Amino acid sequence: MKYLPQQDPQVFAAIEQERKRQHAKIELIASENFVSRAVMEAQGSVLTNKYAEGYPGRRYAGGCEYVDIVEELARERAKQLFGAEHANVQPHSGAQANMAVYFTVLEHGDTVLGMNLSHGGHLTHGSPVNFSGVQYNFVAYGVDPETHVIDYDDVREKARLHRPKLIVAAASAYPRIIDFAKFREIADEVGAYLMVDMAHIAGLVAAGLHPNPVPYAHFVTTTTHKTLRGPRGGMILCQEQFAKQIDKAIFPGIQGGPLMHVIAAKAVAFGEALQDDFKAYAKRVVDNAKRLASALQNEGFTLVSGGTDNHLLLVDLRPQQLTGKTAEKVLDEVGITVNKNTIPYDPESPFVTSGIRIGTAAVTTRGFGLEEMDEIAAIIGLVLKNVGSEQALEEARQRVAALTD
Amino acid sequence: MKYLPQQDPQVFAAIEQERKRQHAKIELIASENFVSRAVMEAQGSVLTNKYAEGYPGRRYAGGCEYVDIVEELARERAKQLFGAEHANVQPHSGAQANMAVYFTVLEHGDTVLGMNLSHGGHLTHGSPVNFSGVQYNFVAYGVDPETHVIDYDDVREKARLHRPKLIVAAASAYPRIIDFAKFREIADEVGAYLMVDMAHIAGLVAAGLHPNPVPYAHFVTTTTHKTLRGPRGGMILCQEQFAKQIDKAIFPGIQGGPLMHVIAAKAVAFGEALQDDFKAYAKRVVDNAKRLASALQNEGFTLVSGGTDNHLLLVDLRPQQLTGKTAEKVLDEVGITVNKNTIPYDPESPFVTSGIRIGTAAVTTRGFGLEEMDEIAAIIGLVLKNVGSEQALEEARQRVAALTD
Ligand SMILES: *Cc1c(COP(=O)(O)O)cnc(C)c1O
Ligand SMILES: *Cc1c(COP(=O)(O)O)cnc(C)c1O
């Protein structure tokens, strides 16, 4: 940076604080990652100065010749990476990606089937305080009370009874592989559309380490950030027959002018995802997640579903008589960043919780391998089993600093 | 840039093309502007790596200490600049800013009164192909057929007959000052809320060159870009009593995690707007718009409302038997960027139009004064009155290059 330190010292000081914070702490929030320096440079570009209302070739304003190339590059790389027939890279967020699809297929008050929020489902999948649960009639399917894997018979039963117009699959906190083939099999039985929100698993789908939902779902939504390691934003993937309708749901549907500088960064992020080292990176993420899972059990922690198939894991803290809130607070004191998260059939409210959510996507970007996975797990054990001891927390504090150089 | 040229040559080449395009052309689209190098650096920051779901102090995740400072700086500067009691700087766009307010005050199918789209109103003010016109029952008020100024008696008549729950004031293409006091007087009579969408005039409100809608409106929405010369995004301003409800309409209402790097740039943009030279800049914008308006009439062009009170003007092209589409196309050939725009009571469809929309915000940033306003107007006259002559267009092409160095 050059012009910000001089122009706005207060803002630059806070950014430099945040930059050092990202280095000093161990980032274990499953939705967090670190983007490349090339991705950031694209967001700091002059492409913010251009209104590009519409789509490449079909713009409502002139002078879009080169931002069209950018959006095309973003759309073509997305289709190459995921094997989709159509792509829309204009969604401002994953929430706006979901909103647009809902706007396409559903009318106000329509019944939609989604994953239980206490079981793994996202806010945009039918929360009574979110637009989705207010705009539409949302019903829930759950996971098995003891195996914590999606009960696909329950998904079929809920679909056949509630007769939804849409079925949403995918989660914010689900450690296992989602069977999209069985979701389509259920959707075809009740004559409903299928939408997959791969936001958390998108990078793992790109590297072929998680089954691709594209050939099963009518609509596929995702965030460009998280495991895809791209800028903060959204994307919609669909078959050719929904292409025009999905585009119209973004503009002039729910949005105005797109963020061309962010779309530029999406194109950079997709280009980086197509390369071989990203597929090697994403394998290490899952390898690190499996290693962390095994090591936490070795420390005496119960895990939701008894492990992980993807990038994230949930710790059932009830054995140690701890709440997610307590765990989040105490780990923040040593430099480990987690978020409290409801476990399936949680006795505690969503604001207190009985579990914590941990992902390996961010730390794996920093170069964390199998060795440090065991150390992170050792520190978490030291902290949570010795909450009252400041001796342990100071020891843990030093062991966090040893890992982060 | 350093890492993008090496990482993604295709994307960097298109960005460099766009950077040179922004320099080479004369940007006269009223919604366009050029942000400072400090604003861009804030968007190219690591603040994209942080999830900040919630609000400063009341976050759903830890490690937000410094992004809270950023959001607070953005919120406090906004309140200083506009005299508002509360600010929300999380809206991804002006469209999402409007959407959130509608989500707060209205239930599905509620009657809303807004400005006619053919008269100046925005897409988000009740288009039957936009969410606003589908989600809500939108009725329209118009301008005077010969004066092109808002018919405030028509606004009262439409309000008393249709009994709206909300009244929206402000426009995308309205060259005159909007009387917010009379809009509130009408809203109080019918017991309706008042919302002002100052997106186009926000910078002029900041410099005190346009009446502030804050003490008249219950809700004030705006884009952070355009005349405010900030990053691409949205903002909501309201009184203290709506603060909690407006915040809940953004999250967990219509959005997820905010764009902290864009909020950082908003804070930079507001900081730049509080300084004296911005108030001097914004006066030159209006001065340039008045000078361009007078000069275009001197060339024989009819203007909507017979001039301008703000940053933008509309040319009624019917005298020269030209459509907006034809004018937009031919000016693109010489290097002048405009957009076709429906004039009030336009015989031509919104896709062909009878007028063009011109703003001075962008060129004034580049250093354009009164002298070059007369030259721009001279070139526009040369082009549009000699459409068939390539001799004139080549002459015009050279005169565009003389202005842009
Ligand atoms: C992260 C996520 C989203 C969207 O997040 P934004 O903050 O809106 O980008 C949507 N659905 C799921 C399942 C997610 O994980
Ligand atoms: C520009 C504008 C908006 C929003 O534009 P976005 O592209 O959504 O940022 C909303 N209302 C009015 C009147 C505008 O001019």
Describe this structure in words.
The PDB classes it as transferase. Keywords: one-carbon metabolism, PLP-dependent enzymes, transferase. The assembly is dimeric. Two copies of one chain form a homodimer. In chain A, strand 2 and strand 3 form a beta hairpin. Chain A folds into two domains: 1-32 and 284-405, Alpha-Beta Complex (Aspartate Aminotransferase, domain 1), CATH 3.90.1150.10; 33-283, Aspartate Aminotransferase, domain 2 (3-Layer(aba) Sandwich). Helices cover 45% and strands 14% of the residues of chain A. With 405 residues, chain A is of the alpha/beta class. In chain A, the strands form four sheets. Chain A has a seven-stranded mixed beta sheet, with helices on both faces. In chain A, strands 11-12-15-14 form a four-stranded antiparallel beta sheet. Chain A has helices at residues 4-7, 9-24, 37-43, 65-82, 94-105, 131-135, 152-162, 180-190, 202-206, 243-254, 260-274, 276-298, 324-332, 361-366, 370-384, 390-403; strands at 26-27, 54-55, 58-59, 86-88, 111-115, 137-141, 166-169, 193-197, 219-223, 234-238, 302-303, 312-316, 336-337, 339-341, 355-359. At the A-B interface, helix 1, helix 2, helix 3, helix 4 and helix 5 of A face helix 1, helix 2, helix 3, helix 4 and helix 5 of B. The complex binds pyridoxal-5'-phosphate (2 copies). One pyridoxal-5'-phosphate is lined by residues 31, 93-95, 98, 122, 124, 170, 172, 197, 199-200, 223, 234 of chain A.
